[PDB]
Amino acid sequence: AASPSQAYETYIENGLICLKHKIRNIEKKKLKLEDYKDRLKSGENPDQLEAVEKYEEVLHNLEFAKELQKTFSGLSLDLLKAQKKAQRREHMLKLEAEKKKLRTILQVQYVLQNLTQEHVQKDFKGGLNGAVYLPSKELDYLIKFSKLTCPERNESLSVEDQMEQSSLYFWDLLEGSEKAVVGTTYKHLKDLLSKLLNSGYFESIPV
Amino acid sequence: ETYIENGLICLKHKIRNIEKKKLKLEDYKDRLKSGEHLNPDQLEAVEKYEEVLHNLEFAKELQKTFSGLSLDLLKAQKKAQRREHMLKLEAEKKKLRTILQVQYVLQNLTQEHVQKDFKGGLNGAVYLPSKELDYLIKFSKLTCPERNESLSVEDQMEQSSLYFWDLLEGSEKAVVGTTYKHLKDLLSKLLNSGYFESIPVP
């Protein structure tokens, strides 16, 4: 249970305490080597003698490590705010798409609602009054699907139950997947409805 | 500085930089043993050889850890993306079903005989004072308007979709003399009333 932000936050924090732990570990052996140095200076094994030679290496490694630590400790917000900004822009783009998806569902609903009507179906069957001709097979997909998305009120179902079933059909249709439905696919139906939406037929429908 | 690769602190470029200087210094040293004569600057760089070897081993040790932090971060982001996508998908399917429900209610509130039931609490209807019912009627004109051929279908649907969105959000922004919050509450009351499970026929 964590968001993409707190993950990156945990990564930045884990990086800083990483340098802290590494610097403290270098400084620990520096003090261990400085005690090995003062032991021989006052007058006092071979293996240890090998460690005291790396005192310059250990001291230089500490110079680099403290350099990165001060750099990254300030460089945090440069990569941390860039993350916050990139997430904000991401969320807004997704919000936009969500709002546009809702508009699209309502447009499609409007087409499917009118396709339940007899005079509208006859127009697409005969290619009449500005409708695009649909072969009887194609028109049947839309009629059948209009009964799944715009059913007449079925009082044996609860409102909530009926709305949920209709909502799933609108959702899958918008997904345009290859799943099967009323003898075709959602993808085919999403294309059919696009043509109908762009045909201009549904801009004004007589009585 | 170029320590960053896709937002992650990566010393890889510095490691290959240090390694290139190590190979360049190893070449200078071999040309020395063979008998070549180098300008003074190159002679100085040759004395920095052991330091370069130490820096390389230290940088390589740091990359061993920063690569793990990078892997741990990527693993966590994969999980968090999956979780967020899951929740947001279920929240969207729920919002849409809710939208279809309130749409059904608001579309039925345009009918006058249904307004009459809520005026006096007739049948299964919640009694609403006429000001409360007015809020809903005016809102029903914004969410379920009669077709306005001055507008395209797309433009009309866009207008309507915003009112549904702001309704479900339930903010305090003003609309038809009340707020989306209060409207959301009224419509929740109407949904829980059961009146719209079986609308009476006049």
Q: Which of A163, A194, A204, A205 to mutate to test the interface with B (most CBs of B within 10 A)?
A: A163
Distances (CA, A) of B52 to A65, B20, B47, B177: 15, 10, 10, 75
The Cβ-side half-sphere exposure at B2, using a 13 Å CA radius, reads 6
DSSP 3-state of B165: helix
Return the amino acid letter for A132: V
Q: A122, A159, A145, A130: which is closest to A191 by C-alpha? A: A145
**C-alpha Rg value of chain A to the nearest Å:** 35
Query: What does the alpha-carbon distance between residue A114 and residue A195 come to, in Å, rounded to a whole number?
Result: 15
Burial of A113 per CB tally in 10 Å (0-12, 13-18, 19+): middle
Contact criterion met (CB below 8 Å) for A146 and A115: yes
Residues of B in contact with A69 (CB under 8 A): none
* Alpha helices, DSSP H, located in B110-199: 112-120, 130-143, 153-169, 180-193
B154 and B198 in contact (C-beta within 8 Å)?
no
Is B197's CB within 8 Å of A14's CB? no
Measure in Å the smallest separation between the Cα of B36 and chain A Cα atoms.
Answer: 30
Asked if A4's CB is within 8 angstroms of B69's CB, the reply is: no
Identify the residue among A20, A67, A167 best suited for mutation to test binding to B, counting B beta carbons within 10 A and taking the highest.
A167
Cβ contact, residue pair B161, A99, below 8 Å: yes
List chain B residues with CB under 8 Å of A106.
157, 160-161
The residues with which A185 forms a beta bridge, in sequence order, are A180
**Which of A167, A185, A169 is closest to A177 using CA atoms?**
A185
Q: Which amino acid is at A67?
A: E
Helix axes A186-199, A159-175, angle to 10 degrees: 90
In which residue are the tokens 């006429």 written?
B130
In this structure, are residues A80 and A9 in contact, taking their beta carbons and an 8 Å threshold? yes
Q: After which residues is chain A broken (C to N over 2.5 A)?
A: 44
- For residue B6 the two structure tokens come to 């896709």
Tokens, residue B197: 């499970």
The CB density around residue B182, as the number of other CB atoms within 10 Å, is 15
Eight-state DSSP code of residue B195: G
State whether B69 and A15 contact (CB < 8 Å).
yes
**Are B180 and B166 in contact, with CB atoms under 8 Å apart?**
yes
Q: Decide if B126 contacts B195 (C-beta within 8 A).
A: yes
A4: nearest CB among B77, B165, B191: B77
Report how far apart, in Å, the C-alpha atoms of B99 and of each of A96, A179, A195, B103, B131 are: 17, 24, 26, 6, 24
Within 10 A of A176 (CB to CB), how many other CB atoms are there? 15
The verdict on a CB contact (< 8 Å) between B149 and A105 is no
Chain A residue nearest residue B64, CA to CA: A18
Structure tokens at A197: 């939406």
**DSSP class of B196:** G
What does the DSSP 8-state code read for residue B10? -
Q: How was this structure determined?
A: X-ray
Q: Cβ B55–A72 below 8 Å, yes or no?
A: no
Find out whether B122 and B146 touch, Cβ atoms under 8 Å: no
Interface A-B, measured as beta-carbon pairs within 8 A, has a size of: 111
Query: In B, which residues are within 8 Å of A59 by CB distance?
Result: none
Q: Are B8 and B65 in contact (CB under 8 A)?
A: no
A108 close to A193: Cβ distance less than 8 angstroms: yes
Angle (deg, nearest 10), helices B180-193 and B49-109: 60
Phi, psi values for residue A180, rounded to 5°: -85, 150
| Residue B16: CB atoms within 10 Å | 10
Query: A58 to chain B nearest CA, in Å?
Result: 9
Kindly state the helix (H) or strand (E) to which residue A181 belongs, with its residue range.
strand A180-181
| Structure tokens given for A194 | 């696009």
Q: How far apart are CA B44 and CA B33, in angstroms?
A: 16
**Could you tell me how far CA A66 lies from the centroid of its own chain?**
38
- Give helix B153-169 / helix B130-143 axis angle, nearest 10°: 140
Please check whether residue B35 is in contact with residue A110, taking contact to mean a CB–CB distance below 8 angstroms: no
